[PDB]
């Protein structure tokens, strides 16, 4: 009863960290080694984040380098930067490989709080699946006579009060991405 709650106050926390990560990575101002902390490939059948497959340095503050260990994994990586929601293209010398951020953009800015205001509608099924089996899971104890009515009627409600904080978090990592995509 209270375990299901604990459980689903758990899932929900690590949900709102992924959208905080996953907002983390929509530029608003200059590069970031994390901008690309996303970005996976198929690395021998396992979904790999290209900062395993790559060093990630950044000389200035618009540029990054990424630098392939294994010469052969250059496309790859390069194309799963291009198809990524960064919108930007890198170039290549056939050992490393370069990306500047455009300098900004007012279409590009419009764009960025779009995505911003998508990801955190994301986290919020996320987080809504979550009390979904959280209270299947009450419905259950219910049913099978474990917790008196009245207690598992309690926890439907504070289930209920403990999503809302959840999502409310991520609304607030949201409002806060579009703020600084605006004045920053």
Same mark, same amino acid.
């Given at each position: 009863?209270?375990?299901?709650?604990?459980?689903?106050?758990?899932?929900?926390?690590?949900?709102?960290?992924?959208?905080?990560?996953?907002?983390?990575?929509?530029?608003?101002?200059?590069?970031?080694?994390?901008?690309?902390?996303?970005?996976?490939?198929?690395?021998?059948?396992?979904?790999?984040?290209?900062?395993?497959?790559?060093?990630?340095?950044?000389?200035?503050?618009?540029?990054?380098?990424?630098?392939?260990?294994?010469?052969?994994?250059?496309?790859?990586?390069?194309?799963?930067?291009?198809?990524?929601?960064?919108?930007?293209?890198?170039?290549?010398?056939?050992?490393?490989?370069?990306?500047a951020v455009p300098q900004?953009?007012?279409?590009?800015?419009? +764009?960025? #709080?779009?995505?911003?205001? =998508?990801?955190?509608?994301?986290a919020k099924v996320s987080?809504?699946?979550?009390?979904?089996?959280?209270?299947?899971?009450? =419905?259950?104890?219910?049913? +099978?006579?474990?917790?008196? /009515?009245?207690?598992?009627?309690?926890?439907?409600?504070?289930?209920?009060?403990?999503? =809302?904080?959840?999502?409310?978090?991520?609304? /607030?990592? #949201?409002?806060?991405? /579009?703020?600084?995509?605006?004045?920053?």
């Amino acid at each position: 009863i209270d375990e299901a709650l604990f459980d689903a106050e758990e899932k929900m926390e690590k949900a709102v960290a992924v959208a905080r990560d996953d907002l983390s990575t929509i530029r608003t101002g200059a590069a970031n080694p994390g901008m690309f902390s996303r970005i996976t490939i198929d690395y021998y059948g396992a979904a790999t984040p290209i900062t395993q497959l790559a060093s990630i340095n950044v000389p200035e503050a618009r540029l990054v380098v990424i630098k392939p260990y294994e010469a052969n994994q250059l496309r790859a990586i390069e194309t799963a930067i291009r198809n990524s929601d960064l919108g930007v293209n890198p170039t290549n010398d056939g050992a490393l490989i370069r990306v500047a951020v455009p300098q900004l953009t007012e279409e590009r800015r419009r +764009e960025l #709080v779009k995505q911003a205001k =998508h990801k955190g509608e994301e986290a919020k099924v996320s987080v809504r699946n979550i009390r979904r089996k959280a209270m299947e899971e009450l =419905h259950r104890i219910r049913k +099978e006579g474990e917790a008196g /009515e009245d207690e598992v009627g309690r926890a439907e409600k504070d289930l209920d009060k403990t999503t =809302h904080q959840y999502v409310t978090q991520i609304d /607030e990592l #949201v409002k806060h991405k /579009e703020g600084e995509l605006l004045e920053v």
